[PDB]
Ligand binder design. Structure first.
Ligand SMILES: NC(=O)c1ccc[n+]([C@@H]2O[C@H](COP(=O)([O-])OP(=O)(O)OC[C@H]3O[C@@H](n4cnc5c(N)ncnc54)[C@H](O)[C@@H]3O)[C@@H](O)[C@H]2O)c1
Ligand SMILES: NC(=O)c1ccc[n+]([C@@H]2O[C@H](COP(=O)([O-])OP(=O)(O)OC[C@H]3O[C@@H](n4cnc5c(N)ncnc54)[C@H](O)[C@@H]3O)[C@@H](O)[C@H]2O)c1
Ligand SMILES: [Zn+2]
Ligand SMILES: [Zn+2]
Ligand SMILES: [Zn+2]
Ligand SMILES: [Zn+2]
Lengths: 374, 374
């Protein structure tokens, strides 16, 4: 590789729902006007990457999954204004643009032009940029960063520093700034409150380290893996609760702690049952429960409209409700400026091709955010 | 009146779920250690007064219903200097205390010294204050305004304009406040927006007013009573709609109209399926649905956590987010300035006794607000 024409690199194609990844030879076509193929350096193993091997998150397979990654640019397209090559850029699973009333609303985020609410499984014109044996393989959302190269459009490529830790700063293309932005944007943790965070994972530590900046005098953590409680207390997690150690329902306990309920509560697992237990555990009259997580598809939660009627605002968010192409660059100069710490999350840093133990740590248990290097 | 100890009067009791109100003579005792006794001037028939009757709003029985009323004091108890005898007052159904959380909280409206979350038959003391026969009759909210005289609790009551129409302002006890309180305080309707309004009657008419004052351009109101479609323009609306004129779900009709979806979708019906159809009806990524309406008993509803994940916020509220003892005073006071209208809401002033007719005027469609003079 490198070029103007077809690069013949390596990738990790899913060919089938519930099987490991086949590291392979695929051939990434040179970009198409307003696209920007990017030479991948580092990637992150999110869950929403694993929801795809189970099929809890449904996208057209066969596909080069991956979406939370950093890398450097080589080739750009026609009329491309935003990033020039040799550029460190970080790919955007939720794009930005300019027109669609959501891109033009003070409080939007979720660009009409996504591929998350009902997936085509391709580029922005309907075609691939990934051909394996002879069969084009599907891109995911609009990043596919488990290749050695990828070709993203222009509206979903953010351009950061140039002295930036991409073995670090790749947790901003998702991981951190969705759990961060939830707590400080979407929920808006009031200075001095009681926060309960269900799920103490990658995204759920950033949400507790968003509350802790928001002021938050208290912050509890609920995980059924007491093993997670440390990286947690260590992040600014005051009281950790394991629902398994308890006889009575957990909303109660959670609600007997802060009795009345916690000002704010966040669900970062994505279970229809916890997605409600988190709503029940806050305050009738002014309890703001937000859901970050991603449930098993077309699945319905059985809730009581009365839960909401006393005065609880229920929200949701993809990303941190962070306007993608002017919030990801801005959010790096900060890390670089010791605004936060990306290190306490990261538990491993594996070579790409072992990307199958990578998933198997995450899911096969405790060991929170690995970073496969390319 | 000769006020010092017990009285007898006419009350509209509801001995049984499903049967009309019997205007029995009822003997109402003196205000105790803190309360105030009131003789009623007027009352409106709010649907919630109808719910107790169906079996969908379960407070204990037998009970004097009613909660939307203005009157003047008679008696007044001990440890008091809030409202003195011969002083207009509006009974309140969601009290205050200034004691509790929600009350001390700048944004809490659900006091937590109330009887709608866990109806009791009341009286903070835990007691009687009504006996129709030799049988004690129950209180509806800290109120029961369907009797000639009732004796509330000083925590749930309020002194007002002195030179104030208790025949125009008994509607500031619910109907109008909640309608308008839910659009201007709990939705924080915006200017330029398009709010859709489900249910074009009592309260849903006041919501079509904040929506007009909050300062917006399109207020689309949806009812199954084409007949209800003009007050709705008089008082605000532009477009009016009927789900029965349609081969397509009303969700959609309404989602192209604002195509992209509405901005601020309200529901003031009490329909568990209308609660969702409106969830869905606002912008996937920045729409706010305020559940106004009071649902069936402990009947739950279904939806998938992705209507919320995309960005819509789903709040709810009682009264209209309006604290209790600080508003009805200043609200009424706004009326006097002819700062808002209270008549396009009122269609029938019927004398009490003639109550089992105003109810019979609801259930039909001939009535919006049938005020019950005394
Ligand atoms: N809204 C968005 O844009 C967005 C962004 C990123 C991730 N997500 C989703 O949020 C979730 C969190 O992502 P992640 O990478 O940190 O996942 P993860 O698997 O590493 O985290 C899941 C965590 O929840 C815990 N957990 C499991 N069952 C639990 C239960 N019953 N009660 C409490 N805790 C329980 C696990 O022990 C673990 O700590 C995923 O489902 C992901 O898909 C959404
Ligand atoms: N949250 C609170 O504190 C509060 C305060 C007051 C009233 N409420 C509740 O709000 C609701 C509205 O009360 P109201 O006094 O205005 O009642 P109302 O009878 O005057 O209003 C109901 C209206 O909605 C219309 N409607 C019903 N089903 C419909 C459907 N499927 N599709 C379209 N339109 C439909 C009906 O024709 C009727 O005109 C009730 O359930 C009441 O109990 C709640
Ligand atoms: Zn856009
Ligand atoms: Zn992710
Ligand atoms: Zn209170
Ligand atoms: Zn009412």
């Amino acid at each position: 590789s490198t070029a103007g024409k077809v690069i013949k690199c390596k990738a990790a194609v899913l060919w089938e729902e519930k099987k490991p990844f086949s590291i392979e030879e695929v051939e990434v076509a040179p970009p198409k006007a307003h696209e920007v193929r990017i030479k991948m350096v580092a990637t992150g193993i999110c869950r929403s990457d694993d929801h795809v091997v189970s099929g809890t998150l449904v996208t057209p397979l066969p596909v080069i999954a991956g979406h939370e990654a950093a890398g450097i640019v080589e080739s750009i397209g026609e009329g491309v204004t935003t990033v020039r090559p040799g550029d460190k850029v970080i790919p955007l699973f939720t794009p930005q643009c300019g027109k669609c009333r959501v891109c033009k609303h003070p409080e939007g985020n979720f660009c009409l032009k996504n591929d998350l609410s009902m997936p085509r499984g391709t580029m922005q014109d309907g075609t691939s940029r990934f051909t394996c044996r002879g069969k084009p393989i599907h891109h995911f959302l609009g990043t596919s960063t488990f290749s050695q190269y990828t070709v993203v459009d222009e509206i979903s490529v953010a351009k950061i520093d140039a002295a930036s830790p991409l073995e670090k700063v790749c947790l901003i293309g998702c991981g951190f700034s969705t759990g961060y932005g939830s707590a400080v944007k979407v929920a808006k943790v009031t200075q001095g409150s009681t926060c309960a965070v269900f799920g103490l994972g990658g995204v759920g530590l950033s949400v507790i380290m968003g509350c802790k900046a928001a002021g938050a005098a208290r912050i509890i953590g609920v995980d059924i893996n007491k093993d997670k409680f440390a990286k947690a207390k260590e992040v600014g997690a005051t009281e950790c609760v394991n629902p398994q150690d308890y006889k009575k329902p957990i909303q109660e306990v959670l609600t007997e702690m802060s009795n009345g309920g916690v000002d704010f509560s966040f669900e970062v697992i994505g279970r229809l049952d916890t997605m409600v237990t988190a709503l029940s555990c806050c305050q009738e009259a002014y309890g703001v429960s937000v859901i970050v997580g991603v449930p098993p598809d077309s699945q319905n939660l059985s809730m009581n409209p009365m839960l909401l009627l006393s005065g609880r605002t229920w929200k949701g968010a993809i990303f941190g409700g962070f306007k993608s192409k002017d919030s990801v660059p801005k959010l790096v100069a900060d890390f670089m400026a010791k605004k936060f710490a990306l290190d306490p999350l990261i538990t491993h840093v594996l070579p790409f091709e072992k990307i199958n133990e990578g998933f198997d740590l995450l899911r096969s248990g405790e060991s929170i955010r690995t970073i496969l290097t390319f």
